[PDB]
Design a protein around this ligand. Structure first.
Ligand SMILES: *C(=O)[C@@H]([C@@H]1N=C(C(=O)O)[C@@H](S[C@@H]2CN[C@H](C(=O)N(C)C)C2)[C@@H]1C)[C@@H](C)O
Ligand SMILES: *C(=O)[C@@H]([C@@H]1N=C(C(=O)O)[C@@H](S[C@@H]2CN[C@H](C(=O)N(C)C)C2)[C@@H]1C)[C@@H](C)O
Lengths: 243, 242
């Protein structure tokens, strides 16, 4: 149920990219990858962890509803993009880590641990501090596991209410056309070596659905756009993205 | 306390059309329009009815859940874009009336009437045949009432499950950026005279929300793009777009 698509490393060679793409039609029982070994290798989730963190935040009541506004207290934040009040969708889409760090502290270790067990989320290792484990701690997850987790979310089959799964799904829409709809989330983990870049999500086109996860080593910061463009080119070539 | 902004009319006269835009910031208690009278006048909803129809289809269980596929039976349809299997978002986004006429049939008049009452939807008149009333029947709704209805949907305050309100909201997304999200639906009602063009929806911009509803008299298909361009120009003047 996972096959190595040699037809794909051609897209990684031009930019000298060490990375993996996993692409599954309908279910995680029909996947292909450019690299079987790397597909199952676990990497720091970085900002992709905002997807389970948001679901857990809602399930525990730490996050009130999709209308909650996370107010900026005026204190300097690492990125200018974070120095403003944010909705839940805004916090996710601009990757506002201080909002999610506060959410993780309020969830707490015991509940965080349990929910990552219920979600089968990577190595389920939350060592390194309740507000740091997905940034520079021990949590690790593979591209295959990402696509299993997102398929569950799409189907409302995670161990969470359908309502809370639906709230997080709308928060992840990144491209909307009358032809197709994309839900997705990037990551850049600078707290590990090599640094890791992610783009994960799913595409609904016509009456089909494709789940994907991409990660790569980030050799330098100017390579960051490849985390979306390489998988985008692959999916465009297969007809998955595009009208 | 809806306010009249007469300067907005320049956008209609620039394009030789008659119509109304209603725009509200935060809630339906802070609204402005170019034409106070027309803002409250009721017009056939046409394809904008797919919003309540979708919600009612899910509430009644006619639509199983968000992943329902509406299979095309091979019989010819009025638009080639409807001759295919469609998801709920697909059917809404291409305005596939045959899908919604089958939903309305299965819902039935008694349940359709009950929900339009709960939703305070226009004159709630579903005379005209169960699969025709919003296309050539007696149903009529104003721009103000569309904004009130969509405000209730945004807030999950319609008389339907939160889940089903969320499902239809995702089906209505038409533009997405990290801090800017648009949910919207067009309409063209040619089963009435004059014909009516609509665009209704709401914009979530940073932490603010703006609800809107636009309609205009349509001679024919050629003026349909104005349903988006006139609202876009007014909302730009209000600082919402850029
Ligand atoms: C997540 O993995 C980490 C964050 N992801 C980043 C990235 O993808 O560049 C940055 S935050 C960045 C601020 N400008 C961007 C934006 O506003 N949009 C793309 C909408 C995102 C950061 C390193 C971290 C939070 O773990
Ligand atoms: C609804 O008001 C009516 C429909 N609205 C139409 C319109 O706005 O032109 C047409 S269907 C139209 C065909 N192409 C459009 C589209 O976005 N795609 C093909 C992607 C949809 C129709 C008269 C009616 C169904 O009530």
């Amino acid at each position: 149920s996972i096959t190595e698509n040699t037809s794909w490393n051609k897209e990684f060679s031009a930019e000298a990219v060490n990375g993996v793409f996993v692409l599954c039609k309908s279910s995680s029982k029909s996947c292909a990858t450019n690299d079987l070994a790397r597909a199952s290798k676990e990497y720091l989730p970085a900002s992709t962890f905002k997807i389970p963190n948001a679901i857990i935040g809602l399930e525990t009541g730490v996050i009130k509803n999709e209308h909650q506004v996370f107010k900026w207290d005026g204190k300097p934040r690492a990125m200018k993009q974070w120095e403003r009040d944010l909705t839940l969708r805004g916090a996710i889409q601009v990757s506002a880590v201080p909002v999610f760090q506060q959410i993780a502290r309020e969830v707490g270790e015991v509940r965080m641990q349990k929910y990552l067990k219920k979600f089968s989320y990577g190595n389920q290792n939350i060592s390194g501090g309740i507000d740091k484990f997905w940034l520079e701690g021990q949590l690790r997850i593979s591209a295959v596991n990402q696509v299993e987790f997102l398929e569950s979310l799409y189907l409302n089959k995670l161990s969470a209410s359908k309502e809370n799964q639906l709230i997080v799904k709308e928060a992840l829409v990144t491209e909307a056309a009358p032809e197709y709809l994309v839900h997705s989330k990037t990551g850049w983990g600078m707290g590990v070596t090599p640094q890791v870049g992610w783009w994960v999500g799913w595409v609904e086109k016509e009456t089909e659905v494709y789940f994907f996860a991409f990660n790569m080593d980030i050799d330098n910061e100017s390579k960051l756009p490849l985390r979306k463009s390489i998988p985008t080119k692959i999916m465009e070539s297969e007809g998955i993205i595009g009208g």
